[PDB]
Ligand binder design. Structure first.
Ligand SMILES: O=CCCCC[C@@H]1SC[C@@H]2NC(=O)N[C@@H]21
Ligand SMILES: O=CCCCC[C@@H]1SC[C@@H]2NC(=O)N[C@@H]21
Lengths: 566, 177, 566
């Protein structure tokens, strides 16, 4: 009918239905939300600074961070003493190591935030980081995993949060075939929590297991020995394609200098006990002997160069690309996010978020009239086709079917998946249970777990209960996890668990007010005591923590990380 | 050769009425024009137009099988053959959005019945070609159901209407969407 | 509760629930059914005899077969003339070729039964067979496909039913890796239906295509040239690992003896034109030159011996096994089958049939309370575990789901499948259509076609319409098909098509009786004019035709045929 184009015009124009046009009006509601978000990011963006240069914050105005006041002078004294030795006490080794003008990720940050409670009731162990810093680094045109042991040995070298971080880094590198670089500085072991860190599985032995399984798959790895690595820490220099020992302060020992005493205590110099022995000794241990920190870092870079990965990365990830920005300003991402601590769940939207994040502000909807709860479709993220699952409302059987169908197509055509978690939302109606809802949930989870597609999840907010099993979860092998500040990970019910567990717990009929004070308030305190900031990341649950505004850059880092894969 | 093509194209409606270069018998042009008018009033394009709308401009096309079912069946009327201007479908290789694809379109000719022993064979030939060459298929579906007259010839046995369903699953096994 | 066994006793006893105890009472209803069956088998079992020794039935009492009287004297004269030549005119070559005490199948029989209508109105072409005889034969401990060209050349060598039979045999052999043996006697081609048999595809060229594709897969094939094979028939002796030419009457030609005349007509002896030339000619054509029929058959057997397949077959199919019979008498199979030509569908059962066929009369039911329409479960057939799908009633969505689940398990564990076809039975209710019944039917057909498991189907009765797409059909690659006498293969409706097509066909409101006489009676005649005996097998639709009583033996032949497969 008076309409005869050739699909384009209708396409390739600034007027295709594919795009999205949710324009906000900045009203009170927007302000209430936008403002809060701002109230939910300032310190997130801040604590980072405090742990960075940990314990030395000369401004002394860090009231925006709820961190307790710490003895700045002690940390400054320790840093001065350490830097007088001739080694750089910072993450400086990293940004010296990575090529200028390139990107970085800082995979796990704020690790071990106020984790352990000391004997002093008001004092926690001052683990500003997990004892290491981990991030994806691009060296000499080669993408690599960077792990650096921090010089914080006051509490002890490695904790249940340190070895877990190291093992997570090793698993990520092995999955993605990114070579690792380890910067080694250790105080040995922790002889206090040794039962928690040494024996059992997924412990310090699995590091040695991984450093051999990698070299089986011919994924070369490199370690730099800046200081002592004793107590089983001396095997990494031994199990290494290339290793670096600094001329003066680089030391490697299987038995400590105190250990020779009380067992043939003919004590001699710490150099002769296994440290950097530049005298043409009989031992052929340690590939590189470098006179200075810069010399060692330079030789590490030079060894990284001769791996032939530059051609493969350059072919797989195009270095010269034209950035395509979204149609709407990314600062608006905080506004559509609702507020917090609201008796009844507030309202929420997804279209706006996806239209703000994706390229050209576009989307490819599958069936949206049907199973209106769940959202699935294709997209574009900086030159790469992506699939997104974002959740909105209370799940039905049909939503599970649609999810299974989408995941089937994505696995069929080798399209990566992105997850945006939300509430559990399993209806409890009797008719729904009689309609085989459990079978359809199984249909969804089977497809989720069976998918060989790389998978990344990011918390939008309100991910509580067994609903994440429908979409995705840490136990379903997501190659990366990141989080927004307004996240709560809890039991099958965030608010309802309060009501349900109020009924069935040794309660007399009378004393109703005192009981709800003792029951409902207490369970609310329990189920929102956990949050994005503490229960997560600090314990390497969903290790990555980010800002809602800069999500697309992070996801693009992740996707470039997962295309060197076999 | 170059001409009959034109006649089956816009089949049965040749306003020039000078198609003596084609030995085709004179057909009731008014009936076909009436049918096409009624069909286009419905809101759907009665032609191969769906195809050249679907394929990118400036690109090529093949029209794999043409003149299909040319004067094939002899009707009860001795001087009349069944007016199957095409095989009931049109098949050609099409390049869509930079992607080469097989295009199969069911014609709206349902006067004789949807599918014949020449229609299912054309569809199956297209499916075999696509599977051999790993070109994805696009089917434009318009049907009058089945043909309950030659049903023994088209429904049972092998290489029939079931093999279409067989191929549409064997393709998705090989991940050829 | 006072019950503490160890599973057996409860098991390994003559009282396990696994078995089945449907005992008949031989009542009128049984008689009506049992008797009819008997009325449905006598001639089935008989025509076989008539085509066997075709056209020569000395009893002349073959009134039990509706076959028209034929000139017996002419056929006897032809057979006498042919046997005077020195070659055995019968299937005798086969049972001479196969080891004594072994089995045989006769894959396609009654082929080309009264197919073509001649110029004479009351006369059909006398193709007692398809011109060939095909059956699975076990030679020298090696299972092989046997194809023998009958000496019936009165109508012409090969027909649209002959080449289809040959190609079906070749496809079966290639799928099952059974070597073929061809017994070649030809009158050349048929220059009357040549357009129907020579050009196009799936024709005489595909025989030559298959005889080369087999030798690519190293599946050796053997041909015996008893008489002339001209008109493209001379390539099979040329395309053969081993070929046999009889000393006197074995001839091979690319150009006929009449063909030399009118084109340099220097006629010479038919021996010199390409026949058996035992004079040490320059041609190295034809491996074996045998003085007698027995000598040629013996050399064929000797060549078959040196293939090394005996060890592989003996390992795969155990030669020394203990037969386990069912608990109930197989003669009762005809009784549970209802009668025929009944206005409204009669009643039917399945349990009894499966309990009569399987080993030990046992079964392994999946969910039978749910989707009570369709039947699926495991079984035992002569030492081999089997899966059976037998249909009973009108299909639902849940029946399709159960079928898909069963086929999934069977493919997962590599269990063969058996099909017992029945009515279409797709409900037309609006609520059922609104419940996504089409999606569930697609779910079923997808699993049916995708299954790599060997598949065999046998017609129980009433297989009409698109319902077979749910279970299985010829277009879904069943490696064998067999049929019972009471079978009807028709449009989506056997009885209802009459009612529906009565309404919508140029009918005036009045003249109702004359119209139903002209409409309903006519469509009934059309939709039951087709049947098991004519429309099937004779046209190689479901090529195998059997008796209901001897089904388990046939299915056991089929399963042993499908374990030499790769
Ligand atoms: O429309 C009313 C039904 C609401 C169901 C909410 C589901 S039921 C289980 C889960 N726990 C909750 O508190 N909400 C979800
Ligand atoms: O109970 C009433 C429903 C009857 C369904 C009859 C089924 S629907 C498809 C098939 N075609 C027929 O003519 N009858 C069956």
């Amino acid at each position: 009918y008076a309409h005869h184009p050739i699909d384009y015009e209708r396409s390739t124009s600034k007027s295709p239905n594919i795009l999205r046009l949710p324009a906000n009006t900045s009203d009170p509601t927007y302000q209430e939300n936008m403002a809060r978000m701002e109230g939910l990011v300032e310190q997130l963006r801040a604590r980072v600074r405090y742990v960075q240069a940990g314990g030395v914050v000369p401004e002394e105005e860090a009231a925006k961070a709820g961190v307790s006041i710490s003895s700045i002078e002690a940390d400054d004294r320790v840093r001065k003493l350490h830097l007088s030795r001739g080694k750089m006490l910072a993450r400086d080794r990293i940004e010296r190591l990575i090529d200028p003008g390139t990107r970085f990720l800082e995979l796990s940050q704020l690790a071990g935030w106020d984790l352990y409670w000391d004997d002093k009731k008001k004092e926690y162990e001052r683990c500003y980081s997990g004892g290491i810093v981990t991030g994806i680094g691009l060296v000499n045109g080669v993408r690599c995993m960077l792990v650096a042991n921090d010089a914080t040995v006051k509490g002890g070298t490695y904790y249940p949060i340190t070895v877990k971080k190291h093992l997570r880094a090793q698993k990520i590198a092995e999955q993605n075939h990114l070579p690792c670089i380890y910067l080694v500085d250790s105080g040995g072991a922790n002889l206090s929590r040794q039962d928690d860190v040494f024996p059992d599985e997924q412990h310090f032995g699995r590091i040695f297991y991984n450093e051999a399984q990698m070299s089986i798959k011919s994924i070369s790895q490199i370690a730099v020995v800046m200081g002592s690595c004793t107590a089983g820490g001396a095997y990494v220099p031994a199990m290494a394609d290339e290793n670096i020992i600094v001329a003066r302060n680089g030391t490697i020992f299987l038995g400590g200098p105190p250990l020779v005493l009380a067992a043939t205590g003919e004590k001699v110099s710490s150099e002769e006990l296994g440290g950097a022995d530049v005298h043409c000794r009989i031992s052929g241990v340690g590939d590189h002997y470098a006179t200075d920190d810069l010399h060692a870092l330079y030789l590490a870079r030079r060894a990284v160069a001769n791996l032939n990965l530059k051609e493969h990365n350059e072919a797989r990830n195009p270095t010269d690309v034209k950035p395509v920005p979204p149609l709407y300003d990314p600062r608006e991402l905080g506004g559509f996010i609702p507020d917090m601590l609201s008796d009844v769940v507030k309202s929420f939207d997804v279209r706006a978020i996806i239209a703000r994040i994706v390229d050209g502000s576009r989307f490819d909807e599958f069936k949206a009239l049907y199973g209106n709860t769940l959202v699935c479709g294709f997209a574009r993220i900086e030159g790469m086709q992506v699939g997104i699952i974002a959740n909105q409302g209370i799940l039905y059987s049909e939503s599970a079917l649609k999810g299974a169908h989408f995941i089937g197509l994505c696995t069929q055509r080798n399209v990566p998946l992105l997850f945006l978690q939300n509430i559990t939302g399993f209806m409890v109606g009797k008719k729904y249970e009689e309609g085989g809802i459990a079978r359809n949930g199984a249909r969804l989870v089977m497809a989720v777990s069976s998918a060989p597609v790389p998978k990344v999840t990011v918390l939008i907010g309100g991910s509580y209960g067994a609903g994440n099993y429908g979409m995705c979860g840490r136990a379903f092998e997501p190659r990366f996890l990141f989080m927004w500040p307004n996240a709560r990970i809890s039991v099958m019910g965030g608010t309802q668990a309060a009501t349900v567990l109020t009924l069935t717990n040794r309660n007399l009929k009378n004393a109703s007010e005192a009981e709800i004070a003792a029951f409902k308030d207490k369970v609310k305190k329990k189920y929102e005591k956990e949050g994005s900031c503490y229960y997560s990341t600090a314990r390497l649950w969903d290790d990555g923590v980010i800002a809602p505004e800069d999500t697309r850059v992070v996801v693009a880092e992740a996707l470039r990380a997962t295309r060197l894969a076999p």
